[PDB]
Amino acid sequence: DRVAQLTLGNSTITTQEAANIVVAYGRWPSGLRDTDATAVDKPTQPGVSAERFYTLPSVQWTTSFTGHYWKLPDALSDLGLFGQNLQFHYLYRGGWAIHVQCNATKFHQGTLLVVAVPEHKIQAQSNPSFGRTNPGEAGAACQFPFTFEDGTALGNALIYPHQWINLRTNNSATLVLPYVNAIPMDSGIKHNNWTLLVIPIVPLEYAVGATTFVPITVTIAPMCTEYNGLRAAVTQ
Amino acid sequence: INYYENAASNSLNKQDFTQDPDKFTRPVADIMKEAAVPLK
Amino acid sequence: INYYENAASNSLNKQDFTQDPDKFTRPVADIMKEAAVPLK
Amino acid sequence: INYYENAASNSLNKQDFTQDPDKFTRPVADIMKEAAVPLK
Amino acid sequence: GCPTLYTPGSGQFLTTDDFQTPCMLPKFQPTPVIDIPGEVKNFLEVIQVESLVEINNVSGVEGVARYRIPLNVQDAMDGQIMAVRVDPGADGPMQSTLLGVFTRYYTQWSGSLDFTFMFCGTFMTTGKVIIAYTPPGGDQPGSRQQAMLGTHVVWDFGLQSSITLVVPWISSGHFRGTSLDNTIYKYRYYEAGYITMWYQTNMVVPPNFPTEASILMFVAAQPNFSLRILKDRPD
Amino acid sequence: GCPTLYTPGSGQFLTTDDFQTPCMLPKFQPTPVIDIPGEVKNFLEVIQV
Amino acid sequence: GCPTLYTPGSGQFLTTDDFQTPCMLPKFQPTPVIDIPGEVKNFLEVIQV
Amino acid sequence: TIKNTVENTVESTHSISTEATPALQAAETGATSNASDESMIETRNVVNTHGVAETSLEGFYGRAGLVAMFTTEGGIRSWYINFGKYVQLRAKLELLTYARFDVEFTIVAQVVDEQAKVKDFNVDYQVMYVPPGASAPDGQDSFQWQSSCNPSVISNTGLPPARVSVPFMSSANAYSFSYDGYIQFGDTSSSSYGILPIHYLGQLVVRTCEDLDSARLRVRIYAKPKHMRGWIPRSPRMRPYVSRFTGIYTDAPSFCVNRESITTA
Amino acid sequence: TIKNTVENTVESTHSISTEATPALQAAETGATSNASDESMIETRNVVNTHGVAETSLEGFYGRAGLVAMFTTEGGIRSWYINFGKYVQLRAKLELLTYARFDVEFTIVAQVVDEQAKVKDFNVDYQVMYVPPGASAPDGQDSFQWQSSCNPSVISNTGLPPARVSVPFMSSANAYSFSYDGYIQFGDTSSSSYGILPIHYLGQLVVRTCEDLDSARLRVRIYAKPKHMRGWIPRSPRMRPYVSRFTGIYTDAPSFCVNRESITTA
Amino acid sequence: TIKNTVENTVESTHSISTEATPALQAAETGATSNASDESMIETRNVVNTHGVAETSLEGFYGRAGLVAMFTTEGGIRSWYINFGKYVQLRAKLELLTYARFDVEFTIVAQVVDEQAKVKDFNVDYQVMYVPPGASAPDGQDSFQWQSSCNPSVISNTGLPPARVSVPFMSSANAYSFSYDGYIQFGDTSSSSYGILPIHYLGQLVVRTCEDLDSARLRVRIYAKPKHMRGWIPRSPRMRPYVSRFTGIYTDAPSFCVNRESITTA
Ligand SMILES: CCCCCCCCCCCCC/C=C\[C@H](O)[C@H](N)CO
Ligand SMILES: CCCCCCCCCCCCC/C=C\[C@H](O)[C@H](N)CO
Ligand SMILES: CCCCCCCCCCCCC/C=C\[C@H](O)[C@H](N)CO
Ligand SMILES: [K+]
Ligand SMILES: [K+]
Ligand SMILES: [K+]
């Protein structure tokens, strides 16, 4: 179906031009098991205060738009009680729900790929800056979309979880991601597990005189979260 | 028969099967059957 | 006993028989017995 | 299987357990339980 | 002790061998296995995913523009949109795809292919196209009558954005070679046929609309597909 | 390990020998056998023509 | 005797190896074990002090 | 569910209907097409017995490849254990995000003159493994070569090659071929980015037990993974490598060869 | 029906009759004669125990023979894998139209001077198998010799000979020793005739791991078929071979020696 | 009681009470603390499967290490059997007061010039074990080398290394790595103190079976304990060794590195 409603904590989202929902690697987010756990102190599970939708500032699909990205959990590291719990604790674990929105008339044509990639490094340059590697809640521009910022073909990104927004068909994309790592928990301030990338593959065009200014908007929820190792608050 | 103490000593595995690829090819929340239209 | 994984590793076959050669020596549609004349 | 006559010929032992360390850690004549005070 | 005799091949280091050996650390116990999403057991699971074809590979075309096929409003009938050879290990548009890179790790292939196309015009844009597979025996077909005598589909642009053509396994032997290189081994023997696209009607638009639109082209293996004899990727 | 003694003829390459050997491609599965007319098992069948 | 093939790593001296070997004195019988206080089996017992 | 052969094919007849439409698809949803062959054309029966074993992880990964090649200087050299210098095995391991495996190492050694011309001369060599925090030898005759705790292998250039197995030795639950993070707290320097210190397991050090006159050892190392397990397949590498310890690359405007026009095959 | 010995002989008496005529035959029909010994003369009983095993396909084919012999130039040489250069094994395989078999290959190598006089000198050699579409090495030190995907064997001129098995590797259901056709569509050129590209499986490439001074490797390869199956016996070859890849020949007016007259034995 | 893994962890809740006080302790009593983790903080369940095998006596002691290294002078040398010359294995055995074990000895030998440069030359060597009260050979050709009662091993510098096992050979019920006493009655001399004559089991003597011209043997010996048993753990050694047969040392005012202040980590 083409209608959907997502509800988490005190927050709700609706859409009328959906295209199903993706659940990455066929798994939903879940808790750490007693056989797989290592840290011995009792974990913190904040519930509805952390697990709810947050909305990041918007991006304009200009004439020159090459693409944009966000790092998780960097982007949400300074927002609400997700942010404060992540600063006060040494270790973090959890999954995500993601919803990308972009609307335009029946007189517009264009297409975006919306893709979530595990362990994505920035490496077109000898020495990536801290600004490029951790761009915060504003995100940063793609300078090298054809090589996917990492030395692979853009065309083969579809091995990672993705959807398309095609302006003749749909106006939103939805992804659900579980926790992925080689260890049971990790530092939230030193390591980013996922990157969310939005890339135009067919450029934006329209009937002469139609509305030219078209935003793209990203909304994100933490899901199934736990923390260990409480201390004072610490940031990079 | 294994001649040595630790399993790192053993020879290569012989369980060379494949499995259903739907965790990578069709990872969607609601089912879409072959004969139907996808969006309805 | 075979020591290796693939059959190309095995030693030579030991089934060294022969068989009736009529597929090469008498490949004719109608039978012609020894004691009879062939064309009748 | 052992190929030689004397036990000095045999390979290394495989009984690699540990045991309760109280002969070195708590070698005292009267018991002092965790929840109690030691001197009373 | 036991009498023995040692045979030729003694002391040789063969890289694809398989024997038991003494371990540097005999008493080491490794960390536990934990639950991680997305375990893979066979690369046939990966090759079955769709990836984009670099179809517009011509001199003046660079970067993301090389993934788009053009369409435009016509003023004459039955015209051609694109052509390509279907051979998956061959140099050209297929070579950078997932299916192309794994096929370049191996010398032989067998099975059906899935080609899938998606339209990216406005909601108001309409048209119909015909997509044909031609088995081997000559050159690519020179007209729409010559093309529609082979395996084909007619595609109508509407609500469902996309269509699949299946290229079925039609071969003399059970396997084909992945190279088509003619200077030494005459392997042009194994060439597998062509795929071509023509206008069935025309692309039609309202007043002041964009008169040019794009298609995107995806390729994947089907469930009867397989590979033999590993070799070093020439890229 | 086991005591052994190695005999004369060790390391010789005799062309009519018959021993097992390691394979260059251990996991390779060959094409099927199909029905073809005129299979031969012994050249005494041919000499009788 | 039995045909054999000898593999790489033949004749190497690896210090952490573990094989049976011939004894210099095959008929020697050692003294008895006696009761001594403070036997240790694992150095985890010592590190806990 | 698990399979040992590829899928069969059944007979199929003509269809004229409104009710069943397998050719129509929506790529927007993120799913790959599900049109079968039998739905799209009239098919015959085929019993297909082709196997799937050469494309298993054991199949693809289970064979030896070069990881190091060096000569001694003043009767010694050392090597940091890391699979980045030779690109063929590097490019295969970066097809997975996380992997667990054991390794079988093979060592091949020979004597050369000062003109790098080979010499018919048999000599004893020693290889020592030195984990992080252990002291490495300074030269050919240092007292760290007693090797009473560190493992060693000792061998001769006239025997067959040396070989040992090694188990899965990481502090993590798998090795990592991509890592989007920094080495340590309070050091966001650009040289501290995209390295996991957890894959670093130490050095190998090599010497001749005695001093050669004028000659040197040349040494090669081959590695073979065994018992592979793997998670989260990655896009394959498509540009040249530049550096041993980083993924750095240079951009270019195409991946495949050009042609005269899109309508000419 | 199957047999492990040749046929016995029974007793036979005189015959005077119109009813039975085993000596009369008609060669026109395409059948070989069926007159038995016992029908043509008076015979005695003989229990015959002669076996049939030396003339089986395993019997006739199961022994090694020479396929290649070459020297290195600048520390390298390569060989196209094809059994045409040495005529003895070639002339045996062309007694069948179609065959399936595995092969056991044996490699023998030694060092020579520039005057082709042998040298008492032990050296490491490497053999690499390069299937079609793979890049072959250019010289002694090219980076294709890492061998991480292509199979290799590495060995020394002072060990016993190298040996490996290989399975049935064709894309067809059998190899072909006759092929009446062309290589590809739209190329009826006379050099494109009577070659099957399906028997071509690639090259072997050989090097010394290090540079010899003045000396070269000389190398010989022997091949032995195993597990033979065979279809459609052919007439045996009766004129000299001329070329490695074709059946070309020159005519002559006889096959056996002449004599003074037909009536003189 | 015996265990194959380390201890698990259980869940724990808050406590407010006068009745239970696990944090209070009295070090005066000579006992180590018994406060568990779960008593001191709120804990979660953890099933812990880490093993204990690398820290067993067989684990820690069961690998070979260097005990002797020497060259022949006039075709002979001898060695007093004692593990004091090389400090790494010495420092490990002095972690126990008393031990019983068997030993596996490995011998590696090679030819050198007078400039201590190695030589490609294969020679026969002999090793003889001479217990106390037996006559040792005087030179390369003495008649004690008949070896009809004393054990010998004979071998060649071009075979792999020589190796033999030895059982527990002391007159005592264990070897001793500390001995607070004198060698004999009526001799309280300071050189007679802290030696046990019971660990002394004799010499090894080495020769070349024939006279080398100008060259010498160089020889190394490695020892590996097997089947260890151990009593009464000692404090570990913390100052350099000075002498082969005694524990003598020099004092110094610290053991670890200094820092600027006690309040700065
Ligand atoms: C005496 C024999 C020497 C054996 C020394 C063994 C050391 C252990 C090596 C384990 C292999 C580690 C592989 C892990 C990761 C790779 O290096 C990646 N390329 C790191 O980026
Ligand atoms: C490292 C060892 C090298 C092994 C390389 C094996 C390659 C496979 C060879 C299979 C034998 C093919 C024989 C087929 C046909 C004959 O060549 C005919 N004379 C062709 O006309
Ligand atoms: C032909 C092979 C030679 C074998 C000779 C064997 C002799 C027996 C040696 C047993 C080992 C004795 C170890 C006892 C004590 C240590 O030496 C201590 N460091 C003494 O202070
Ligand atoms: K099947
Ligand atoms: K008979
Ligand atoms: K436990």
Numbering used by the authors:
A (entry chain 2): 9 to 244
B (entry chain 4), C (entry chain 4), D (entry chain 4): 30 to 69
E (entry chain 3): 1 to 235
F (entry chain 3), G (entry chain 3): 1 to 49
H (entry chain 1), I (entry chain 1), J (entry chain 1): 10 to 274
Authors' own words:
Enteroviruses (EVs) form the largest genus within the Picornaviridae family and are one of the most widespread viruses infecting animals. During the viral lifecycle, the capsid precursor domain (P1) is cleaved into VP0, VP1 and VP3 which assemble into a protomer, the fundamental subunit capable of assembling into an icosahedral capsid. Following genome encapsidation, VP0 is further cleaved into VP2 and VP4 forming the mature capsid, with VP1–VP3 responsible for forming the outer surface, while VP4 lines the internal surface of the capsid. Here, we characterize the capsid structure from a possum enterovirus W6, classified as EV-F4, a recently isolated enterovirus from the Australian brushtail possum (Trichosurus vulpecula).
We used cryo-EM to reconstruct the map of the EV-F4 capsid at a resolution of 2.96 Å and build an atomic model. The quality of the cryo-EM map enabled us to build an atomic model for EV-F4 for residues 10 to 274 of VP1, 9 to 244 of VP2, 1 to 243 to VP3, and 30 to 68 of VP4. The structure has the usual picornavirus architecture, with the three major capsid proteins having a similar β-barrel fold with the following two β-sheets, each formed by four β-strands: BIDG and CHEF, while VP4 is located along the interior of the capsid. EV-F4 loops, as for EV-E1 and EV-F3, are shorter giving the capsid a much smoother appearance. Shortening of VP1 BC and DE loops in EV-F4 and EV-F3, but also in EV-A71 results in circular 5-fold mesas that remains open in the middle instead of the occluded star-shaped mesas found in poliovirus. In both EV-F4 and EV-F3 the VP3 GH loop insertion extends into the canyon between the tip of the 3-fold propellers and the 5-fold mesas. EV-F4 does not display any charged residues in the canyon region, while the corresponding region in EV-F3 is slightly negatively charged. Interestingly, in EV-F4, the north rim of the canyon has a prominent patch of positively charged residues, which is reduced in EV-F3 and further reduced in EV-E1. We modelled this fatty acid as a sphingosine, similar to the models of EV-F3 and EV71. In EV-F4, His208 replaces Asn208 in EV-F3 and -E1 as well as in the majority of EVs, introducing a charged residue in proximity to the head of the fatty acid pocket factor.
